[PDB]
Amino acid sequence: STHFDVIVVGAGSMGMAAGYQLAKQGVKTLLVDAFDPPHTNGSHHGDTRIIRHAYGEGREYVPLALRSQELWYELEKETHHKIFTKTGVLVFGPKGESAFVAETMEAAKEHSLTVDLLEGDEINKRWPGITVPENYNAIFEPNSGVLFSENCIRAYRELAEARGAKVLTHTRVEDFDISPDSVKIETANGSYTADKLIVSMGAWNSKLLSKLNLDIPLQPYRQVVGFFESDESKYSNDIDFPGFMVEVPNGIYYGFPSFGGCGLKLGYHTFGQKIDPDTINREFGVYPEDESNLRAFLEEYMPGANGELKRGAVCMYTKTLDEHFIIDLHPEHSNVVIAAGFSGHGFKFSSGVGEVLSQLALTGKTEHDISIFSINRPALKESLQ
Ligand SMILES: *Cc1cc2c(cc1C)nc1c(=O)[nH]c(=O)nc-1n2C[C@H](O)[C@H](O)[C@H](O)COP(=O)(O)OP(=O)(O)OC[C@H]1O[C@@H](n2cnc3c(N)ncnc32)[C@H](O)[C@@H]1O
Ligand SMILES: [Cl-]
Numbered sequence: 001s002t003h004f005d006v007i008v009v010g011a012g013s014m015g016m017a018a019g020y021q022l023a024k025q026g027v028k029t030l031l032v033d034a035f036d037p038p039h040t041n042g043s044h045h046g047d048t049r050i051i052r053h054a055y056g057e058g059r060e061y062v063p064l065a066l067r068s069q070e071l072w073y074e075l076e077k078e079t080h081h082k083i084f085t086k087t088g089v090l091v092f093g094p095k096g097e098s099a100f101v102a103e104t105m106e107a108a109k110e111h112s113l114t115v116d117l118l119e120g121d122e123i124n125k126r127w128p129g130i131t132v133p134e135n136y137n138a139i140f141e142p143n144s145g146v147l148f149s150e151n152c153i154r155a156y157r158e159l160a161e162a163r164g165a166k167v168l169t170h171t172r173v174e175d176f177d178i179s180p181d182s183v184k185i186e187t188a189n190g191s192y193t194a195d196k197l198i199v200s201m202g203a204w205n206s207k208l209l210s211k212l213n214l215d216i217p218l219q220p221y222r223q224v225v226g227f228f229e230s231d232e233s234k235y236s237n238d239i240d241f242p243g244f245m246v247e248v249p250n251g252i253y254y255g256f257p258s259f260g261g262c263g264l265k266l267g268y269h270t271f272g273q274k275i276d277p278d279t280i281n282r283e284f285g286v287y288p289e290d291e292s293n294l295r296a297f298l299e300e301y302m303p304g305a306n307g308e309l310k311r312g313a314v315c316m317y318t319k320t321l322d323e324h325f326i327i328d329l330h331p332e333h334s335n336v337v338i339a340a341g342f343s344g345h346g347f348k349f350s351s352g353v354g355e356v357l358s359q360l361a362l363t364g365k366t367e368h369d370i371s372i373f374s375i376n377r378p379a380l381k382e383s384l385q
Helices: 013-023 059-078 099-111 121-126 149-162 202-212 289-301 347-363
Strands: 003-009 029-032 049-051 089-094 116-119 136-141 145-147 166-168 173-179 182-187 190-199 219-228 243-248 251-256 264-268 309-319 326-330 333-340
Touching: 003 013, 003 182, 013 029, 013 149, 013 333, 013 347, 029 190, 049 059, 049 347, 059 099, 059 149, 059 347, 089 099, 099 136, 099 243, 116 121, 149 166, 149 347, 173 202, 173 333, 182 333, 190 202, 190 347, 202 219, 202 309, 202 333, 219 289, 243 289, 264 289, 289 309, 326 347, 333 347
Parallel strands: 003 029, 003 190, 029 166, 089 243, 190 333
Antiparallel strands: 049 145, 089 136, 116 136, 173 182, 182 190, 219 264, 219 309, 243 251, 251 264, 326 333
């Protein structure tokens, strides 16, 4: 009960998905987490997460986006927890002045994705509640939408445990001991060994990968989101208000329609405070920017959603220099798999990454093309310690 086929350190978004994929195949797995997933100390809380297919960060993410979407529909059918709502996703910005909008459109064209292209008042007409200038243009993806992130992790966990996966909670891994033919982790609750290791500690990857002789630039950011009292006749998912990710002059913002009257949810993507996951302040409102940055967007583009602040949440991104993920084998240990640096946009791919991680851990290879997430790519600035 202390040696396993595979050990996953960090059973959050990526780790729990990998655990489900491994258990599903009869592989004896141990998932270890410092807390009890899903929780509010990592990067997966706040209830909802956007999934987009036409991908503004890069058209090369489309295949993984589509596989992940199919896997989310499979999860929906396997659990009693709500997984996905097809709100559609709206992307807009000043015409010819948004690289994000442009790449989303190009990604759609290249993968033959279903989208609606509109501009100026056509946007305001279609979605009462949105007020953009006449020079703005947009691309709407009707078949993408919103995932209930905490539900996703809970379902994957329940399914994996039912299949035999063991989950050791409130147990912080403090060190690693890797050998040619096995792996070992040290915790205050005991040491555990296995044949393969998957490391997916989220924001903590920036602090602990050095324990694996890895020196990779990874910066954790404090990123808040606020839920606002809104005009339900305009912003409710029931009246088809969409999820959105947009780029305006001062940056990128993302939001969600109000679900069951929870209020419209908004986040500012471009800015966040550089922090350490062990000292970060998880209280919303301690920095003037928390609420002011959100209201400045709402007052200008979605005025009817600028009501009382119903709830605020504080979460973390873990950025790489090029803002692309790290999914690969440890350069010096083929029996160690690393999943890190999701840079604020990886939850939607967590179902697909779970699959990738499972394959890398069991075979050292994957049917997916993950070259752009290579741990040895130059733009990363990686090296040994
Ligand atoms: C924060 C945030 C992120 C975000 C977003 C909005 C906010 C405010 N909106 C998104 C969206 O609309 N669409 C999307 O695709 N992504 C969005 N994101 C990003 C996404 O949430 C993150 O990329 C994702 O959650 C990253 O997942 P990962 O699995 O890396 O991180 P985690 O879920 O935090 O899990 C890490 C786990 O590891 C554990 N841990 C940490 N250290 C240890 C040690 N030492 N020992 C054992 N376990 C450890 C944590 O407890 C955690 O469970
Ligand atoms: Cl992240």
